[PDB]
Amino acid sequence: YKLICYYTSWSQYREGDGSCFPDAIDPFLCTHVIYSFANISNNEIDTWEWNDVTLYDTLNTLKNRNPKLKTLLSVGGWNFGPERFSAIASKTQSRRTFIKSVPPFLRTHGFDGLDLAWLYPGRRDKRHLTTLVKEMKAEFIREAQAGTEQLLLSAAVSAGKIAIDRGYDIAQISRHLDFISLLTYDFHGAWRQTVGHHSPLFAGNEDASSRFSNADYAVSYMLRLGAPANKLVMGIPTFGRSFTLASSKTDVGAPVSGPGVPGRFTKEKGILAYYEICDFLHGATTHRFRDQQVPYATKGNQWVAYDDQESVKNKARYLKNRQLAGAMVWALDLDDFRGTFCGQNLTFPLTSAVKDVLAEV
Numbered sequence: 473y474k475l476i477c478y479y480t481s482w483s484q485y486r487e488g489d490g491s492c493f494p495d496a497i498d499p500f501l502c503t504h505v506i507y508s509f510a511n512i513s514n515n516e517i518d519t520w521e522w523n524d525v526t527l528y529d530t531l532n533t534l535k536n537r538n539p540k541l542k543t544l545l546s547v548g549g550w551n552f553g554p555e556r557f558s559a560i561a562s563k564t565q566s567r568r569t570f571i572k573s574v575p576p577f578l579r580t581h582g583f584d585g586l587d588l589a590w591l592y593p594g595r596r597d598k599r600h601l602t603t604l605v606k607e608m609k610a611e612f613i614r615e616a617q618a619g620t621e622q623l624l625l626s627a628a629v630s631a632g633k634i635a636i637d638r639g640y641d642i643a644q645i646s647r648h649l650d651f652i653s654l655l656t657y658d659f660h661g662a663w664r665q666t667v668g669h670h671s672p673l674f675a676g677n678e679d680a681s682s683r684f685s686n687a688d689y690a691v692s693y694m695l696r697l698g699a700p701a702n703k704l705v706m707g708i709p710t711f712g713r714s715f716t717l718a719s720s721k722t723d724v725g726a727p728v729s730g731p732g733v734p735g736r737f738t739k740e741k742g743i744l745a746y747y748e749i750c751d752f753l754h755g756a757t758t759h760r761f762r763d764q765q766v767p768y769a770t771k772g773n774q775w776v777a778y779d780d781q782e783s784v785k786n787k788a789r790y791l792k793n794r795q796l797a798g799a800m801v802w803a804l805d806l807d808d809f810r811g812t813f814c815g816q817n818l819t820f821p822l823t824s825a826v827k828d829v830l831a832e833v
């Protein structure tokens with residue numbers, strides 16, 4: 473089983489304990505660590521933060537302690553403009569240019585592969601995304617002839633029924649990608665004025681219409697479209713999405729007035745790190761959707777959909793039972809990486825819980 477873990481560039485800037493650098497990562501925790509996010513300039517892959525070359529270096533030195541550890545660099549990301557990816561891929565010349573620039577870049581900075589986080593391709597992009605993946609893999613196959621270990625190529629894909637149908641030719645890209653990470657966590661949001669869990673495992677017989685917004689549907693659907701389970705990796709959240717209630721109502725369907733107040737460390741409305749949640753819980757009322765098998769908490773006019781050790785182990789058993797290649801955790805720097813926020817002195821509680829179940833039979 474594979475355990476793919478994402479580490480974000482911008483987390484180094486968070487004040488106090490929220491501050492997190494590559495060296496805080498347990499070299500034996502994950503099988504694959506992915507640095508997010510590289511950038512694209514003059515149609516070439518490039519750094520993003522000013523000190524990336526330094527952090528790249530710090531991250532890849534983890535491989536000195538754990539020789540089996542693999543690292544990848546991800547291009548794209550939610551804030552990277554999709555149109556940008558789009559213009560690059562639609563033109564053979566600009567696409568070949570971006571492709572030819574990757575290997576050298578990775579080799580120099582000691583990465584073992586590239587991760588395409590094109591988010592998200594439109595109806596007019598499906599064909600070119602297939603092209604990008606095919607040609608990028610062909611380049612990696614070629615570059616290996618020089619004697620070095622072949623580079624890995626993965627991709628982060630939406631778990632949204634409509635998003636999948638719209639811009640991905642799953643059957644095609646699966647045969648060229650080493651593993652596909654299913655983003656099975658932003659199923660609900662705060663774009664909709666109602667309370668809901670973003671990463672439910674199962675549907676939940678109550679109030680429906682969605683039926684497609686849960687991990688079990690996404691996995692099954694992907695398997696149906698032609699993706700081998702031995703290449704599918706399921707995404708497990710390490711952050712929660714918050715809401716500001718519009719009424720004293722707390723149960724399913726409750727009215728929402730907008731995102732949640734920012735966390736002291738992550739400073740972003742609508743998002744909370746697991747370590748901020750651990751502090752949030754004190755004095756909060758905790759609940760759990762039995763059908764969906766996930767928890768949520770409420771304090772004041774604040775409502776939080778999150779994942780705890782239990783929900784996470786539960787999702788881990790799930791992918792094992794369906795025989796998937798493994799789990800994908802977003803992100804190591806939102807987990808209790810210091811292990812001084814969530815009680816039981818343990819570094820990376822959530823990611824660890826995943827690792828134990830996978831380590832099990």
Ligand SMILES: CC(=O)N[C@@H]1[C@@H](O)[C@H](O[C@@H]2O[C@H](CO)[C@@H](O[C@H]3O[C@H](CO)[C@@H](O[C@@H]4O[C@H](CO)[C@@H](O[C@@H]5O[C@H](CO)[C@@H](O[C@@H]6O[C@H](CO)[C@@H](O)[C@H](O)[C@H]6NC(C)=O)[C@H](O)[C@H]5NC(C)=O)[C@H](O)[C@H]4NC(C)=O)[C@H](O)[C@H]3NC(C)=O)[C@H](O)[C@H]2NC(C)=O)[C@@H](CO)O[C@@H]1O
Pocket residue numbers: 481482485509520521522548549550551552589591628655658661711738739740743802803
């Ligand atoms: C919210 C929503 O609806 N969107 C979701 C998507 O998130 C979701 O995408 C997938 O799943 C992940 C979680 O859902 C997703 O989220 C993450 O993506 C974006 C980036 O793509 C992250 O954006 C952060 O936002 C930060 C603000 O909160 C921002 O911080 C600023 O960062 C800059 C540098 O990075 C700092 O500047 C530096 O400042 C110092 C001094 O302070 C200087 O010394 C430096 O020189 C400065 N200069 C620079 C530019 O380097 C700055 O201090 C800092 N401060 C501020 C103003 O707050 C980050 O820059 C930015 N990151 C980027 C690259 O833009 C989100 O926060 C992430 N969300 C969470 C939660 O983690 C991923 O994109 C995606 N994952 C995968 C697998 O790809 C999708 C479903 O896919 O659904 C929705 O769209």
Ligand SMILES: *[C@@H]1O[C@H](CO)[C@@H](O[C@H]2O[C@H](CO)[C@@H](O)[C@H](O)[C@H]2NC(C)=O)[C@H](O)[C@H]1NC(C)=O
Pocket residue numbers: 511512513514519520521
């Ligand atoms: C990532 O690369 C992009 C593309 O090269 C950079 O985008 C900008 O580049 C110029 C310098 O800021 C701007 O004048 C361009 O208008 C703008 N390009 C586009 C299409 O928006 C960007 O600077 C890089 N990002 C970081 C964080 O370094």
